[PDB]
Amino acid sequence: SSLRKSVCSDLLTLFNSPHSALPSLLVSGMPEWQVHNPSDKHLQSWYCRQLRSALLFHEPRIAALQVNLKEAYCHTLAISLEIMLYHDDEPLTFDLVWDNGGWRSA
Amino acid sequence: QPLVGKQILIVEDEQVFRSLLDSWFSSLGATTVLAADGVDALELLGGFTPDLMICPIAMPRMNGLKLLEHIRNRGDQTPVLVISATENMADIAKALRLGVEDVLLKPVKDLNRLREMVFACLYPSMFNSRVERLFRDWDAMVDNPAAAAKLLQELQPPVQQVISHCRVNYRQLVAADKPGLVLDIAALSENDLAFYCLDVTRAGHNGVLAALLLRALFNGLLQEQLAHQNQRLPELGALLKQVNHLLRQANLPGQFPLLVGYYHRELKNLILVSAGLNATLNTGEHQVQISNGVPLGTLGNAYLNQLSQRCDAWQCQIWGTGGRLRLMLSAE
């Protein structure tokens, strides 16, 4: 649908455009921290909590959002967004991976 | 008002944000103490131990992490919520090591919308503050629909009571579910009151959870609104808009048919708004049938324009798919 396509493109822009509204802490900080520091369950749960809040803050079309860190990508930070949009009966899952600079739609 | 008897230390160098935080916590019933910076905060902690301190990281004279490490190194278990514009992950890691409720992140503009984030962050601890048993804290409620439901039933108002010089009576007229149509009525002062009716069957488990959260925060949301106007002129549609953002931020998706009402016993004004519920109001003047089939949780912006009707005594049938109740009010 035209709706599911525009939300996805604009999410991608939030994670990659260098002058995103999303806090820099969440776009680049956390990935660059995980390369130099041992992983911590409290930091990872923190990251998902605030990333979820920031996306809800900056994408009014999302009605529900769950943010999880994907396990199998141990070599780099990988994020799974489970979105529900207003006025669309069907969940949208968007998977993002950090590598070579920014984020990529898997 | 779930924070009555509790002390909040608000540490904030920016006057606009400090006044916002002051209003939010005062409206929930807390005693708020204000500090301009980290040294002022530390000096004030010399006299009392709050149930919560809120502070940023960057601020004059002493930063938030040095203040946190200072009170932790001294032995205090004081709950600390951090709200920061930092860009340094080392700050985050240091705060979480030291022990915080959370580190929330700020936006550039629009500090108003942090309210839902803050309340949704803190609401577990508010529910648990009345659990004073880890089979009965908030998480056990989230993970046990049966326990959640029966606690909600246990909290329904009595069928007959006196609120703000008004006799208020209600009665469930159908039994569609375990809890079905739920109700809460509260004084706002000695002369006015407010109430809401929520159908908890449209979102299932999230509906019960929404009802427990709304019972704790509904009064405070109205108090915050009345506090910023000279004449007590409630705007119930602004309440619906805020409740919708609150449930969204609290991760409670679904459909929430919700009717809100307000009544002033001297002015004789009854104000109603309905998102997703039907109502039939009978007074001496007219019979008034209100309907709206669009519940909360289905629109980004849940604002609606309210109805108002002067009257001395009234009765109101409210129904949705979840059931039907009759609410009655007359002068005491």
From Swiss-Prot, chain A:
It is found in: Cytoplasm. Interacts with RssB. One of its GO terms (cellular component) is cytoplasm. The chain holds residues 19 to 124 of 130 of the full protein. Coiled coil: none annotated. Keywords: Cytoplasm, Stress response. Induction: By oxidative stress. Low expression in exponential phase, rises in stationary phase, translation is repressed by CsrA via translational coupling to the upstream open reading frame IdlP (at protein level). One of its GO terms (biological process) is negative regulation of protein catabolic process. Belongs to the GpW/Gp25 family. IraD subfamily. This is Anti-adapter protein IraD. GO terms for molecular function: anti-sigma factor antagonist activity. Inhibits RpoS proteolysis by regulating RssB activity, thereby increasing the stability of the sigma stress factor RpoS during oxidative stress. Its effect on RpoS stability is due to its interaction with RssB, which probably blocks the interaction of RssB with RpoS, and the consequent delivery of the RssB-RpoS complex to the ClpXP protein degradation pathway. The keyword Nucleus does not apply.
